Amino acid sequence: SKDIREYLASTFPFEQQSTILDQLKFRQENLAELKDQIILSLGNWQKLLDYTNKLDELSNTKISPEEFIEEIQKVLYKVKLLYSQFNLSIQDFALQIIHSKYKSNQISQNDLLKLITEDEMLKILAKTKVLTYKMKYFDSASKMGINKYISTEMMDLDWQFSHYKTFNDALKKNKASDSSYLGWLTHGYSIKYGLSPNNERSMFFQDGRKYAELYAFSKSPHRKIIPGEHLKDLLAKINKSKGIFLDQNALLDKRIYAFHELNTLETHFPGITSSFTDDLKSNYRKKMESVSLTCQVLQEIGNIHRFIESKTEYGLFSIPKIFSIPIDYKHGEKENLVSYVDFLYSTAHERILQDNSINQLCLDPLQESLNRIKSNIPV
């Protein structure tokens, strides 16, 4: 129990993230280091440097809350669209600043909620989350074959993306509907920017009237019994995706894609896919829980493999050079990585069902990941 729980509380990673078993200098250095590679491309590349200096002086200096919101929205509203990659990091660090000190309550949360509820900020953060993820973790995850096991709801748990935890949870505590709104937005952006590559147009997201219908259902749940037009279609598509998910011989790609949107639309608008008869007959909820635990654990092996291979692939501007992870082996690694992986597998295997149509989604990826990860820890 504590044999590894103590170890995960001591090393450099695994603290910023939450494990299914259950720092100011670090980002200050990255802030300082951001301005180095900017000047090397001066040979149109000056506005980014101006923005970087503005953000650096904004974060480092002390500003009264009555002016900080204006300062942070001035820079954030200006950015619109190798050059492109440097631009995304400009706003990713920009809206990290809000969460950076809100945890210290340098800004009243009432003003923070007032800022976020603006239609611009919601879309901006929903877009920048998927862009930041695809910029860094997608390349590493593509090699392992865990590319299809990247879930929008599950992105907040990675250590880098810890500055969406507050933006979602505090918002949910204070303003219920906007949390589901930005969840819908972020999954729409994820499905549009290649995180879920599909040829057909998405029928659940990137459409204002769909969200309006979902919200109208949310506030008056007795609409599901006798819904009007434009909600027959949404329920029919839910049923079609559920049937695709529950299939046995269906292709893995499109089945996982259907599961992802089904999980999003059921988590953020609860009681939309819950059928009393069919779900009980086909063990719907248990299968969803099994697949969700499978996705969590797959992200866990992904992080473990990235850490073991690093001993930069966490991502550009992710971890600074001084605070990097050295290649040298350590005494505790042998006694605390194999056991950690084994306990993760044991915990996963105890509350995941087995079936002819589920073993390919829960058991088979777990065994494949175990085989891949047990043959490279010494090397």
Add this chain to the structure above:
Amino acid sequence: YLSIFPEDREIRRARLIWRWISEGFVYSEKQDISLYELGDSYFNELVNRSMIQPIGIDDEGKVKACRVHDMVLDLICSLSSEENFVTVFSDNVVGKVLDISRFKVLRVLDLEGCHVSDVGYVGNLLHLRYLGLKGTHVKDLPMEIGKLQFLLTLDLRGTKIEVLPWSVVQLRRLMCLYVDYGMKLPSGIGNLTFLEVLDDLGLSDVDLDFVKELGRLTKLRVLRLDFHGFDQSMGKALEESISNMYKLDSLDVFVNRGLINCLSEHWVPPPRLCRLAFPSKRSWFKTLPSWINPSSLPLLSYLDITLFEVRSEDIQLLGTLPALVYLEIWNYSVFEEAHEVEAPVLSSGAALFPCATECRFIGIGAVPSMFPQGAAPRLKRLWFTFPAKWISSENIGLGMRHLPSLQRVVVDVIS
């Protein structure tokens, strides 16, 4: 004509009405009507004669779609199949086998719902009238579409085209422009003097003169819009632009999380209005707009208004409308803000709801006893909110004085 449609699948009435016009069963010599109203009416007696049955209600206050009876399909086939009578119905054989440009003259083209994008050859046919591409996965359309002087329809819902070419302004004749809101219209829209219905016009980050050009388009009956980027006095232009044309029969303005700086308190609406919808429930009017009076717009059959607060006299004023067949009034204060569910008090009047079958006071503290002496003579449906603490001094009653066939309530947690 429906024999072209397959055996077992729903049929939308809008496509039938448009294609009948396009190929030529609709000709009006009166020049007092726009040959769209009569087409819809024609479909109305067609469904009236019990030959076809209705299914659903679309966003035009009419039947969404229909389905022909199975014993009538073979009947119409036997009547008019062997005699002389192109489209793709969920078939992938198109393109790789059949050649479309080979046909020298053809009246209508409809290939919606397919997964093929090879349309760049529209200049080979000129007698074409209907051009529908709903959900055909078409990336782009040819630049020389303007050659088709004869044109009535242009269907582009659910496609990947991101901007229309400017060579559609030259179209001397055009009736319906089914545009998705995401893609931007070309400028100079005012030259489309014969435009008849305009659906889901994307309207944001647009200069004022384009808005002014709309009012030259004096032939509308439905006008579905939205806006996200000019929440300022720019919309004051379209405020009076909508006032110029006098043939409105439906209208709705989608807009999210903001006060409606679109419709003014001193405005003259078209003398005819039926739908006047507001699909987005996150928006609100400051109060009940002053232009809703028994004097003007006395022909509403649909309200669907969300507003920040429902005053005690708001429902009193709403009850004075002559027809008001359907009524759905929301209460933004109760749901999105911590405000008590106040109970309305309708006292004056005698009839107060001549023909109001549907009434959906979502979030309103309306009570069945609050209607005095049959305030709603028919009221087939009713929704309201009833906090549990209201059990004192004969609040509810529910006298059943007005034969409410069904009726659904919402419970409240407190007390």
